[model samples]
Each structure stands twice: as C-alpha cells, then as structure tokens.
Target: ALENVDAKIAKLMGEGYAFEEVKRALEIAQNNVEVARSILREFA
Candidate 1:
C-alpha cells in the first residue's frame, strides 16, 4: 500500500488531487492511475 502506490499516488496529488481523495481511488485502482483519475473526475 505504501511502496508501489507512493509513486503514482504522488503523481495524482501533484496534479492537484487531494491526498485522501486520490487514496480513495487508489484503493480500488490497484495501480491504474488512469482509471483512478477517471473515477476521481466523476466522483468529485
């Protein structure tokens, strides 16, 4: 949860997504940053 995700997770956060919000998506995303963004976009 901490290792692999930190890389892409920061990518999304640096892109302006809140940490928790990104993590929420990351939880279901399982490394698919694109899919996480897709869900986050509409989820927000």
Candidate 2:
C-alpha cells in the first residue's frame, strides 16, 4: 500500500539490500499503488 511504502523501504533496507536497490524497489512499489484498488479484495 502507498501508505506503507516507507515501511517496505525500511524492511528492504534491514534485509541488507543496497540503498540504490531499495530505492528502486520502493519506486516500483509506489507504482503498485496505482493498481491497489484492483488488487485488494478486502481490508484486513
């Protein structure tokens, strides 16, 4: 979720990925926000 991109970015960082890789992953994950409405069937 867009709201959690920062958390995901942090988790990725903690996993030992490079900063650049984490940045790129975060960038890509941000795009996932556009399709989130279609992706989530229901809220937890």
Candidate 3:
C-alpha cells in the first residue's frame, strides 16, 4: 500500500514535478500510485 504511494511520488519527482505540488496532492488524499497518478493527471 505504502510502496505504491511512495513510488508515484518518487516517479513524479524524478520527472521534475514540484515536490510541494506532489506532496500537497498526497496530503489531500491517500491512495495507491495509480490513483495518485490519476489525481495528478487532473492537476496536469
């Protein structure tokens, strides 16, 4: 469960996404990587 979330954040970070934005998304909602990515997509 945790691994997925971390992986998503890490992947996005690696891609140069702002940490504050990613962290904010995560803080607003806890979910798996896929879901997190989907949520991030919305922001994108």
lDDT of each: 0.78, 0.49, 0.65
Which structure is stronger by TM-score: 1 or 3?
Answer: 1
Q: What's the lDDT of the predicted structure labeled candidate 1?
A: 0.78
**Comparing 1 and 2 on lDDT, the stronger one:** 1
Worst 10 residues of 3 by lDDT: 29-38
How high is the lDDT of residue 17 in model 3?
61
Question: Candidate 1's residue-wise lDDT over 1-44, tens digit each?
Answer: 55776887886876686778898788778768888888777757
Higher-lDDT candidate of 2 and 3:
3
Q: Per lDDT, what order, best first?
A: 1, 3, 2
- The residue-by-residue lDDT of candidate 3 on 1-44, one tens digit each, is 54856776787676566677787776666645555566666765
By summed lDDT, the worst window of 10 consecutive residues in model 2 runs over 35-44
Residue 16, model 2: lDDT of 57
The candidate maximizing lDDT is 1
Please give the lDDT score for candidate 2. 0.49
Return the clash pairs for model 3, or none. Answer: none
TM-score of 2: 0.41
